[PDB]
Design a protein around this ligand. Structure first.
Ligand SMILES: NC(=O)c1ccc[n+]([C@@H]2O[C@H](COP(=O)([O-])OP(=O)(O)OC[C@H]3O[C@@H](n4cnc5c(N)ncnc54)[C@H](OP(=O)(O)O)[C@@H]3O)[C@@H](O)[C@H]2O)c1
Ligand SMILES: NC(=O)c1ccc[n+]([C@@H]2O[C@H](COP(=O)([O-])OP(=O)(O)OC[C@H]3O[C@@H](n4cnc5c(N)ncnc54)[C@H](OP(=O)(O)O)[C@@H]3O)[C@@H](O)[C@H]2O)c1
Ligand SMILES: NC(=O)c1ccc[n+]([C@@H]2O[C@H](COP(=O)([O-])OP(=O)(O)OC[C@H]3O[C@@H](n4cnc5c(N)ncnc54)[C@H](OP(=O)(O)O)[C@@H]3O)[C@@H](O)[C@H]2O)c1
Ligand SMILES: NC(=O)c1ccc[n+]([C@@H]2O[C@H](COP(=O)([O-])OP(=O)(O)OC[C@H]3O[C@@H](n4cnc5c(N)ncnc54)[C@H](OP(=O)(O)O)[C@@H]3O)[C@@H](O)[C@H]2O)c1
Ligand SMILES: Nc1nc(=O)c2nc(CNc3ccc(C(=O)N[C@@H](CCC(=O)O)C(=O)O)cc3)cnc2[nH]1
Ligand SMILES: Nc1nc(=O)c2nc(CNc3ccc(C(=O)N[C@@H](CCC(=O)O)C(=O)O)cc3)cnc2[nH]1
Ligand SMILES: Nc1nc(=O)c2nc(CNc3ccc(C(=O)N[C@@H](CCC(=O)O)C(=O)O)cc3)cnc2[nH]1
Ligand SMILES: Nc1nc(=O)c2nc(CNc3ccc(C(=O)N[C@@H](CCC(=O)O)C(=O)O)cc3)cnc2[nH]1
Lengths: 248, 249, 249, 248
């Protein structure tokens, strides 16, 4: 039987590329999405056309609330319903926007940013573990220690994610569950961001003066879930072209 | 006029020692507390007996909820009402218990642990900043963030989040002359509930003296960070751990 | 044409497994050795028997001295003479013994330990770069660099220096398309000398499987780093440690 | 009787400020120097004029060689001869220049840079320890993980220094010897550096858009050698105005 993976926020960009590449390796995948139903289903179609009954979608808001544990339990449950197993969890979905210290309410901002980048991954990890080459891969940030100005809540989520990656690695190791991280520097830049500001980030990158493709990020995930990484756990691999190494 | 400091969870242990020592340096202090009303008021009395009208208590639950921003705003507002200013904020209050991955609900656990160690400090930072000398924030971190004790995922996440905030706030508030730093105890005063044999096992682990830090030794670093001897220091986290974090398994 | 790799200290253990696995991927390899001529030549035979003219040995002492630059230049030159190119450098060779602060001279201890773990890698990096497709350097680091063994100061300094080189070379050589990365074993193949009970004490420490990494598992990460699956990776150090570095004292 | 400190490279800049401030706290000091004899003795006079027989100079090259252990032993020995004790060692002296990967020989470059920033501190630590509120303070670099371009050998020394700080801390703690570090971002800039380059670095600094004075660096050293840091060991305090936190 083929192994099965959950990728959260898998409709677009890096999430999609992870899901595709996992599928190409031989995984059956649950494409999680929140608002991008059209794109999520489109990908399920494309993947099922390649091999039948190997892709399903699952809708859930990963914002922190009273229903979030239940929601995360249901994401893991859908992988078991569809595929009879869950071998891999990739924590990709992430809310990302400025929260300056000085029209959402701040408690919504907290809920979305800490919820998506930290709490959901935590609850998903709990369920993944409860329900059992098993491994979890969290998408981190090579820039966590050199954050962007006014992104404190996001940066807190990403720092919390580092903490979870290490803590889960440690606690789940007796279960043969490896927990690791992939940390993009600048990859696909926000679709909204103007081309000029995209270029300013690109010039910063030592290796090639460009962003990572989503496939290059996916490559590291693929390595981390493979048998070439059986001893690797609690490791966060920067895939950043040397960006985090550049001084101000 | 004397400067003024907010210390969260200041009724006992490390919080109390920070509040006392700040007071001894010449700060007027707001003793924040949650359940320890008796001990918080006791400390206010002791400090006011030393110098009149220099200590006040403030009650607030720092659990995450939609009203926590309002609560945190009111803590900072309490310092301005009492003392007419707020020069220092020490983020000390912290929920601490295991949350294994494998009778509180998890939603409560998340709220208490992430709320106390990260979200409250974030909101308190927001208010401190907006309400504005030598201004500085000091967050109590964990020298063991990267070698967490088993099954303390939620706590460890808060503390990691605290590291992120310490650095992010440092960076954002530096144009306001507000320094943001951290003090990172290894093992200090161990939980009152913890058995003595368990306490000893941690003590033996410590390279420098095979003992825990006194609350005073933790406070000392805070005092340094708020002083003029640290005017250029920001986004720094000082381990006060006796070398614990350096010891391999 | 097949690409070519230099692996230093490749006669035994982790170095041999790296060299073997690079060869199995399709690299022609220079087996560097110091003392282990018999084993180095044995591996060259084994590899050449598999594919003819794809393995050569290269003898050099990597101890620091005024002739080490020349020696390191000659190792890189040996790969160009044999194979007409040099696509990959793996910095594996490493002296490893205690140097307590409190019968070699300390001069020799410095030279061996800092020489092998830092200065040779630096000089080899220099020559690799100067003599110039998917070009990359891989340095064997230490997942325990921040929780060192007792009395291993000189070794630990070399390994910390190696971290510095990994990052600095990454940064400087990136305009040349040369990626510099690291693989950091926790406990892998333990010293042949070490008693079995001491070996077991380390093994029990490991969260993932309570065992050491095989040399093959270390090699696997090197293979990943040199591959096209890591084209955007540089200045990254991948722990291959079974969670060891995460375990508190 | 008053405690005694060795400060290496104490004739100018940060070294001088450390030595002065230690003296002001009540230490007798050994001003080590290499080329700056005039400035070193000038400071000895200034300090002895303040309190008699409290300052001595000490000439030594800290370049790596087969005589360096002997030289380092003699620096520590001079403090014992002068003052009958040695309570504090401050590892400040440091060679600093580019060593690009692509007219000194490279073996000299290695010897100066690794010798000054790492090996001398190592040997001085050895002697300090063997000869016995005792503590060692090493001058590190807040930018060690975001190095300047082409400063590989320097950066290696500084990283080696981090290793030594932590390893000595751990090994010397049973002797009551605390080992810690002070990590300047941008402090006093090289005298040679032009003013506009100096400004480019200054603008990078979040806290005040200026470099640290030598005194601000010295303040942290003073804290680390004091009774207010009795439990602190293997800690490296950044004194960098937030510089290391700024992304490219
Ligand atoms: N791109 C980069 O340069 C970069 C750099 C560093 C780290 N990373 C990390 O890599 C991961 C992927 O990056 P990316 O740029 O592809 O991210 P992204 O497009 O910004 O977000 C990925 C997906 O997350 C989902 N999401 C957002 N808010 C959600 C919520 N409240 N509940 C449930 N799902 C939600 C969205 O799903 P729907 O569209 O279906 O609504 C979105 O498509 C993220 O974790 C990111 O932080 C990226
Ligand atoms: N002690 C150590 O070995 C150690 C080690 C590393 C880091 N630290 C950090 O240093 C700080 C102080 O340590 P400690 O041992 O003194 O802490 P603690 O006694 O466990 O907690 C300090 C105070 O936090 C307050 N608190 C707890 N939950 C709260 C909530 N939901 N809302 C508002 N306040 C709440 C409590 O106030 P009330 O009593 O009034 O209810 C408590 O007295 C903490 O941040 C801790 O994480 C300590
Ligand atoms: N094994 C582990 O648990 C572990 C853990 C962390 C990091 N690492 C790192 O991974 C790498 C390989 O580990 P290992 O255990 O396989 O290493 P090792 O056997 O101790 O050393 C590898 C080789 O280095 C060569 N070497 C030693 N001194 C030399 C000198 N002065 N000049 C030239 N070559 C010299 C030796 O070659 P000859 O035999 O031919 O003389 C030796 O075979 C090392 O860099 C090590 O520090 C290993
Ligand atoms: N300045 C900064 O922005 C900055 C930033 C980060 C870290 N740091 C660290 O802080 C410390 C002091 O900084 P600094 O700018 O004051 O240093 P510096 O002026 O560049 O060097 C200090 C002294 O080191 C001595 N020295 C150099 N090479 C030597 C050798 N081969 N043998 C013996 N002594 C030698 C020199 O003594 P003589 O003049 O007598 O010959 C020099 O005066 C250094 O460790 C430095 O790396 C400084
Ligand atoms: N979830 C997620 N999505 C991302 O697109 C992302 N990007 C990065 C690296 N990218 C960025 C992207 C934008 C800015 C930034 O300044 N963003 C402003 C856009 C300003 C503009 O568009 O002019 C923002 O509003 O988000 C910083 C880092 C890191 N983590 C991410 N995480
Ligand atoms: N807020 C806070 N309070 C602390 O007491 C504290 N202590 C440490 C270091 N202390 C500890 C204390 C207990 C355990 C632990 O195993 N605690 C179990 C107690 C087990 C027992 O008492 O037998 C627990 O239930 O908390 C780990 C680290 C770190 N951060 C802290 N943070
Ligand atoms: N080059 C290298 N070789 C290694 O074997 C090695 N091993 C580790 C992890 N291994 C170790 C091995 C031994 C000791 C240790 O206590 N060694 C004593 C042996 C004591 C005994 O054998 O009883 C020694 O003398 O080396 C610590 C960590 C890390 N880096 C390495 N680096
Ligand atoms: N020992 C030491 N001395 C320093 O002056 C020093 N300065 C810094 C921060 N300062 C610097 C200073 C210069 C350059 C730099 O680009 N230096 C060139 C000067 C170029 C010019 O002057 O135009 C050099 O040649 O050193 C980088 C960081 C960090 N560590 C130090 N360490």
């Amino acid at each position: 039987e083929a192994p099965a993976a959950v990728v959260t926020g898998a409709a677009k960009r890096i999430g999609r590329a992870i899901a595709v590449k996992l599928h190409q390796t031989g995984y059956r995948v649950v494409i999680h999405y929140h608002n991008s139903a059209e794109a999520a289903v489109s990908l399920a179609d494309e993947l099922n056309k390649e091999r039948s009954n190997t892709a399903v979608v699952c809708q859930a808001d990963l914002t922190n609330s009273n229903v979030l544990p239940a929601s995360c339990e249901e994401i893991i449950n859908s992988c078991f319903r569809a595929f009879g197993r869950c071998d891999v969890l990739v924590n990709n979905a992430s809310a990302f926007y400025p929260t300056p210290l000085v029209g959402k309410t701040v408690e919504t901002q907290v809920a979305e940013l800490i919820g998506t980048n930290a709490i959901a991954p935590f609850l998903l990890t709990m369920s993944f573990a409860q329900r059992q080459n098993l491994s979890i891969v969290n998408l981190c940030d090579a820039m966590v220690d050199q954050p962007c100005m006014a992104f404190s809540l996001y940066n807190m989520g990403k720092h919390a994610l580092v903490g979870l990656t290490q803590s889960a690695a440690l606690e789940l190791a007796p279960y043969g569950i490896r927990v690791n991280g992939v940390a993009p520097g600048v990859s696909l830049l926000p679709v909204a961001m103007g081309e000029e500001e995209k270029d300013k980030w690109r010039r910063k990158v030592p290796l090639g003066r460009r962003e990572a493709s989503a496939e290059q990020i996916a490559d590291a995930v693929i390595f981390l879930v493979s048998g070439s990484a059986q001893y690797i756990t609690g490791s966060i691999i920067k895939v950043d072209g040397g960006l985090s190494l550049v001084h101000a």
